[PDB]
């Protein structure tokens, strides 16, 4: 499939530290199916998000419905079936950090994957079982859709 992670999140706070940027807003959200915290930077100018909203987030390694790698190059004249068709807000970034609660001897029970979508930062932290698809310096997509 090419999907590293999928869950439904609920916006629990927007800009706790205050609005830092005008067109960008930080959402602190939590899901229900996996109990994962999410910090996400979104361009609220084009995709406004209100407190208490509920959305489906899908971290993917590729947009093509069939398992097929991406070249990281912009190809607007691409007629393949892309899973971005099923979502409203889509970003493209790279994983730049994976933290955990590991010790010198024990493995990590909880992980924390950090992604940067051209400067818009995301932190998806929760159980390490749900974050095996994430590897540092790896390109991913956001694929986020609002639901009622």
């Amino acid at each position: 499939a090419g999907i590293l992670f999928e869950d439904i999140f609920d916006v629990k706070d927007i800009d706790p530290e205050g609005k830092k940027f005008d067109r960008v807003s930080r959402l602190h959200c939590e899901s229900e199916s996996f109990k994962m915290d999410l910090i996400l930077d979104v361009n609220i100018q084009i995709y406004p998000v209100d407190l208490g909203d509920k959305f489906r987030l899908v971290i993917a390694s590729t947009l093509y419905e069939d398992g097929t790698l991406d070249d990281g190059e912009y190809n607007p004249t691409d007629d393949r079936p892309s899973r971005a068709d099923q979502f409203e807000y889509v970003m493209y970034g790279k994983v730049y950090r994976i933290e955990g609660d590991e010790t010198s001897t024990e493995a990590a029970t909880r992980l924390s994957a950090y992604v940067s979508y051209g400067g818009l930062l995301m932190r998806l932290q929760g159980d390490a079982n749900n974050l095996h698809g994430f590897e540092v310096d790896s390109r991913v997509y956001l694929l986020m859709k609002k639901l009622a």
Partner: protein, 470 residues
């Protein structure tokens, strides 16, 4: 067409005050379908507004309804206080049999008994209910909530008989009539008999009854997972349930239990890639359906996506229903093959066994998982002393259950003489264990010799210490 304009007029007057008195009353009077907190706020200043023009006590219909709001909120205690002071204010309506404060007290007491059920104060709930029924026996909802209370105790109580006499007082009553067959859901051997007891009010005055016809679909789906599908019988049953689901599809696009039924029957048709999508729809529609949590994880383990499945299993365990639900840990331990999928799988089986030691299948499955972990530690292992010492005891226990279940006759409609090949296995596992325990003594003696080897060299480094000292 009358309600959105009502909203607009209500927020045309809420900010205003042309001596607004009831403006909050007809605010909240539509807000009870909507957000309840808006109704709370309307009642809040409505409580005040009856005090300044004259210090007039709030009529108990308001106070009963705000307690009714808090019933679906967490404010259960002051909801009870609202019902108490409601009954007092109705008593303060000493002469108002025109307004029928007595009838208002009747429904208020009904609400308060329903509240005592939320306190699980079923004793006082019984008291209020029998007080109303001894004074208004024509009422039905009290007559069956009592029945529902004994249903919590069990089916063939006066639960079932209050339910049947609720039909005797009112055979036109679809709620109670549905609850009749709801009793019969407990007796699934009364599966094909439920056509008749869910046909009685398939009179078209009651039709359309989405609830009952989905109940027909559900009693028709429990027929499935049988070895007669190849005989086209469950294929016809699948398509018949599909026909019911198409019917409820056309008459309601926005039912969700329907779509759960369609996805379930097509998943029984083996289309599991074609199932997670349709269940995804009801997933955003409302997460608070216990069924869809299970049915999604069945797909996940069908792709062997355990690390997506068992978490959502215990998410289904986040309801305040039952500390060891049995079928959920059954549906958890399916192709669980990794380490925590083995030993913590055993711990889950122990949790289930603790409240369910009666099950033959569960004691078989613990024997199975003990067998798996025993063969995980004796074959390419070359492993610890203590764990292979535990291995022989645990496989001995497994052989005890192999023997014990095989003596029992009744199984899960599939006889478990399969323990016999496990018995030949565990015998050759005895031979393998006698092989590897010698290897355990070998690794013990070599660790003894290497610790002697470090003893001598550390004696030598004390000797160098002595040379530097001299």
């Amino acid at each position: 067409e009358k309600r959105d304009i009502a909203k607009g007029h209500l927020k045309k007057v809420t900010e205003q005050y042309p001596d607004d008195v009831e403006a909050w009353i007809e605010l909240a009077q539509i807000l009870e379908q909507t957000d309840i907190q808006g109704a709370l706020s309307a009642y809040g200043t409505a409580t005040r507004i009856l005090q300044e023009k004259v210090q007039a006590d709030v009529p108990p219909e308001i106070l009963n309804n705000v307690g009714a709001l808090h019933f679906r909120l967490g404010n259960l205690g002051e909801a009870k206080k609202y019902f108490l002071a409601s009954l007092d204010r109705a008593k303060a309506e000493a002469e108002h049999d025109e307004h029928y404060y007595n009838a208002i007290s009747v429904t208020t007491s009904y609400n308060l008994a329903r509240l005592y059920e939320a306190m699980c104060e079923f004793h006082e709930a019984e008291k209020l209910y029998k007080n109303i029924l001894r004074e208004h026996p024509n009422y039905v909802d009290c007559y069956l909530r009592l029945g529902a209370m004994a249903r919590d105790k069990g089916n063939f109580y006066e639960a079932s008989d209050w339910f049947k006499e609720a039909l005797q007082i009112n055979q036109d009553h679809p709620d109670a009539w549905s609850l009749i067959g709801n009793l019969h859901l407990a007796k699934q051997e009364w599966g094909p008999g439920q056509k008749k007891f869910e046909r009685i009010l398939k009179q078209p005055s009651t039709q359309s009854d989405t609830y009952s016809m989905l109940a027909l679909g559900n009693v028709w789906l429990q027929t499935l997972h049988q070895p007669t599908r190849d005989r086209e019988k469950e294929k016809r049953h699948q398509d018949r349930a599909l026909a019911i689901y198409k019917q409820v599809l056309r008459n309601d696009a926005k039912n969700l239990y329907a779509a759960n039924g369609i996805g379930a029957v097509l998943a029984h048709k083996g289309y599991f890639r074609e199932a997670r999508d349709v269940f995804a729809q009801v997933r955003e529609a409302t997460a608070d359906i216990s069924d869809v949590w299970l049915n999604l994880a069945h797909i996940y383990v069908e792709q062997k996506q355990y690390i997506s499945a068992v978490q959502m299993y215990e998410n289904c365990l986040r309801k305040f229903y039952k500390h060891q639900n049995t079928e959920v840990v059954l549906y958890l331990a399916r192709a669980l093959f990794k380490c925590g999928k083995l030993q913590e799988c055993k711990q889950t089986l122990l949790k289930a066994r603790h409240v369910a030691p009666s099950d033959t299948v569960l004691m078989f499955n613990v024997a199975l998982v003990l067998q798996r972990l025993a063969t995980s530690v004796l074959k390419d292992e070359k492993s610890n002393l203590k764990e292979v010492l535990n291995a022989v005891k645990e496989l001995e226990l497994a052989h005890r259950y192999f023997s014990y279940l095989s003596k029992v006759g009744d199984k899960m409609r599939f006889d478990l003489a399969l323990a016999a090949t496990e018995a030949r296995q565990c015998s050759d596992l005895l031979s393998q264990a006698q092989y590897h325990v010698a290897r355990a003594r070998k690794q013990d003696e070599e660790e003894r010799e290497l610790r002697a080897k470090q003893e001598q060299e550390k004696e030598l480094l004390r000797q160098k210490l002595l040379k530097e000292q001299e």
